[PDB]
Design goal:
The structure holds 2 protein chains of 2 kinds.
Chain A: E1 15-20, H1 29-44, E2 50-53, E3 61-66, E4 84-86, E5 97-100, E6 105-106, E7 113-114, H2 115-126, H3 150-160
Parallel strand pairs in A: 1-2, 1-3, 3-5, 6-7
Antiparallel strand pairs in A: 4-5
Helix pairs in contact in A: 1-2
Chain B: no helix or strand
The chains are: A alpha/beta, B little secondary structure.
Bound molecules: calcium ion (2 copies) and zinc ion (2 copies).
GO molecular function, one term (chain A): metallopeptidase activity
Binding site for Zn(2+) 2 (chain A): 121, 125, 131
Catalytic activity (chain A): Cleavage of 14-Ala-|-Leu-15 and 16-Tyr-|-Leu-17 in B chain of insulin. No action on collagen types I, II, IV, V. Cleaves gelatin chain alpha2(I) > alpha1(I)
Chain lengths: 164, 5
Amino acid sequence: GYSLFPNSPKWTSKVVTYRIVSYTRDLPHITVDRLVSKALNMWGKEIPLHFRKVVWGTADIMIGFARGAHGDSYPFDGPGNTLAHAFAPGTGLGGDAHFDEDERWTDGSSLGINFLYAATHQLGHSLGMGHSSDPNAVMYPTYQNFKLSQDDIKGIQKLYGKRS
Amino acid sequence: XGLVX
Ligand SMILES: [Ca+2]
Ligand SMILES: [Ca+2]
Ligand SMILES: [Zn+2]
Ligand SMILES: [Zn+2]
């Protein structure tokens, strides 16, 4: 079923900050903001961790869109091939989630990669989830009405405990 | 893609 990262890195503070740093031409900025919140809350409702949004500076989880090389060691590669990537909890690059601007992204009303699904998968990595062997899992390794699977819930609660 | 660092 689920996996974590080696040595089970996790956020150990009660509050973790996040920032939407850069946007996509494909959607209104407000829509990206609302879908990012919804994705974080899918995972957050299950566990004792709280997320605080910031609008400037460095936050724990930096989220954004980029083309090509963008300051980490893993440049994007134009249309196709890698779509997005995210880093396990930790200082610096840890927690950050990046999306390739050279794809097409949608809120569900157009052609594109469904941004809510993709953000829920990437932010699973930002919280410490690896990939699952269960085809039903959001954390399965390969890509409109979804929720987290039982396997996704079991793994995140294994890592953080359950929310009371 | 999940990356380590
Ligand atoms: Ca970070
Ligand atoms: Ca690409
Ligand atoms: Zn990156
Ligand atoms: Zn992944």
